[model samples]
Target: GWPKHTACNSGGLEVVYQSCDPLQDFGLSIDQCSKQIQSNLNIRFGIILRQDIRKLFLDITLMAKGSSILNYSYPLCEEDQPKFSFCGRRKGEQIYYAGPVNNPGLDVPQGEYQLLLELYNENRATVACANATVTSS
Candidate 1:
């Protein structure tokens, strides 16, 4: 699936042209396949794991300590039917926080970071993992 940031999230990040998905590059080191998914992080549909997010902050140090300026927000629902909004947020981060409404945040750092989004299936198996590399100026 594709991760979508709904209108409730105050719209997606204003990224004009970049060879990478800002979110994936800054958050995780996604594989080639996973990187493909990140390219469309704000389209209309995507899958995010609560467990992955939880552990990301606790275990993933790269995301927690990489970005100095962490902007918190939530992921919005593409459709109103689910009404599935973000539950809550925490201070410490292992993974980058999306947003409460749309769950898409931006880390404005003038450096380099790689975000690899790895999606798993029902049996706790990895389906696809994509990556994005951000080089700030």
Candidate 2:
């Protein structure tokens, strides 16, 4: 769930920070958590039925400082691996990692980052977008 004022893709996508599995909250508002580069914060992007997929491609972007750094896209209605929470209808969101890759217990550089979750229609036109900001310590 998202706060009343936060911009989100209604019935489309919702990003969440797993506070602890450690603890877990399916109803967590996206703004409920903040991230630290040093923490391998577990995250999820909840997906609700947004479009009738048949010929379109779904694209996801991870941006840092307004530039796209990473991306993921799949064929319309194509199921992804590692199924996450999917709300009351079905499966949930996919998972992503944000901490260090080589060094144990280390983290990404301290700064602000953004998650640009998006969906493009058959013609690649931006149809739905869920953008969220995060800060690292």
Candidate 3:
């Protein structure tokens, strides 16, 4: 049904998310989940919008056993972009995101991973989507 869901990566890096879009009121939080993923790693997210978001787009995919090692795309804003911080934001208003996800020299190779996240706006629709199952050594 959903690859067993895995309760947000099982042990470490717990995300335990669900909300493919039931109207919009997403959430994600992480301060510690054991270990794995270094560099910077700090995430806290919240949302509650029904429309109007100026521009934002983030798509990520990383699978292990099935193939797709990693696929990334980011553009959290538009119109000569590069100014992220929730971008324009509007509608119902309730957005919060604490950051710091650097990953400089990248080196992820442990096992058990299959994470997919999607967020779009600026008419692209689909404000949020989440799925998790990530564990690394």
Candidate 4:
């Protein structure tokens, strides 16, 4: 009926994001959700780029485990992967902010690409993840 938290009781980064509704029940894959974030992010976020302007532009949000509140804005560029290090908790966890692409000199092209939100560590372990497929408006 609704999306339940997917991450819990782990050693590495426990990063999980859920839609208001899981798409699989509708015969669609959760992969679509990630792609949806990549695409049409601007539609949900038209003319709003105040708080964390570039990062927040993609309509990406985060919710840390054991905390209902979501901190850290989304990713910006292909290289602008999110790195989280909660001291006394965990180390490097890479978060891919697929939807939020805000580079100064890069040409903003429009197409469908499976953007990766890799959640890895210094050990190169894929832990956290989010995906997006940005379609040009």
Candidate 5:
């Protein structure tokens, strides 16, 4: 599936949804197709930080139903805050794949949720912010 186009307030980054694939489909003992499917799905996404910011770290917060779900920190660059060019792409951008950490950490529960992303510098202050919403059935 193609991800939604969400931007930041300061032309900082773009949030792109990747996919939701079945993580555990090969069950050991099952009835339908040998067994019931496991509740393990993966949520994939991507981010493209603008060139104006030469930072190397980011903090992402996702809230579902007004409740905090994910607060993750990821490094944007390697060591010296260099450009992250890959697969004929530009810098400060990458695709990420994550699964259920806890019982439903990354489950992306069926509801209207808000995604808040902030780019941080060496001083740990917010440089850019992306506000987005995700809906499910």
Candidate 6:
């Protein structure tokens, strides 16, 4: 079968996402599909910022069978919350991020899923948007 992992920019921000996977680091430029995903997934990507990011919001959605099964928003730089690694980045800098999904309690169904990720600045302006398709056994 062909690789089931794919990602692309949504024309909101100047970002380049190279790979998405659940496990196994197949070097830096290889795309690894998830045959079976229980939880922890890592997304590796880079963003060319147009403005400084002091506060950020991550809006995510997971869709399966033409319906959204998971939808949540996360504040990555809220004052009461701990800061993320990408919080203090400045404009004109290319930032690269690779981190785990880290949802150990999530029970995912088999088949293909669509994942949408949007990043927003403090003023609710969209910084970047990414759309990904993942398949699991």
Ranking by TM-score: 6, 5, 2, 1, 3, 4
Relative to the true structure, candidate 1 reaches a TM of: 0.31
User: Over the stretch 1-137, how does candidate 1's per-residue lDDT look in tens digits?
Assistant: 23432111112222221212323322221122221123324332233433322111101112323563333322222223234432232223233434322223344444455444444322343322443344434
lDDT of 4 by residue, 1-137 (tens): 43534322122212233333222211112222221133332111111111121121123332233233333443232323343212112223222222323323322243323333333333333333444333322
TM-score of each: 0.31, 0.38, 0.30, 0.28, 0.41, 0.63
Predicted structure with the largest lDDT when compared to the true one: 3
Winner of 3 and 6 under lDDT: 3
Quality of model 5 by C-alpha lDDT:
0.41
Candidate 4 or 5, higher TM-score? 5
Residue pairs clashing in model 2 are 20-23, 84-92, 85-92, 86-91, 86-92
Candidate 3 local Cα displacement, residue 137, angstroms: 29
Instruction: Estimate candidate 1's alpha-carbon lDDT, on a 0 to 1 scale.
Output: 0.30
lDDT of each: 0.30, 0.40, 0.67, 0.28, 0.41, 0.57
Query: Per-residue error at 137 for model 1, in Å?
Result: 2.0
**lDDT tens digits by residue: candidate 3, 1-137:** 22233233433444455666766446676654444555676767777877777787889898878998879988767744656666576777888888876655334456667778888887888778777766665
Off by over 4 Å in 2: 1-50, 55-57, 79-106, 120-127
Q: Best-fitting candidate, measured by TM-score? A: 6
> Candidate 1: where is the Cα deviation over 4 Å?
1-41, 44-101
**What TM-score does prediction 5 earn?**
0.41
Cα RMSD to native, each candidate?
13.2, 10.9, 13.0, 16.3, 13.1, 9.2
Better of 2 and 5 by TM-score: 5
Residue-level lDDT for 1 in candidate 1: 29
Q: Candidate 2: what lDDT?
A: 0.40
Off by over 4 Å in 6: 1-35, 38-40, 78-84, 105-107
RMSD of 5: 13.1
Clash count for candidate 6 is 0
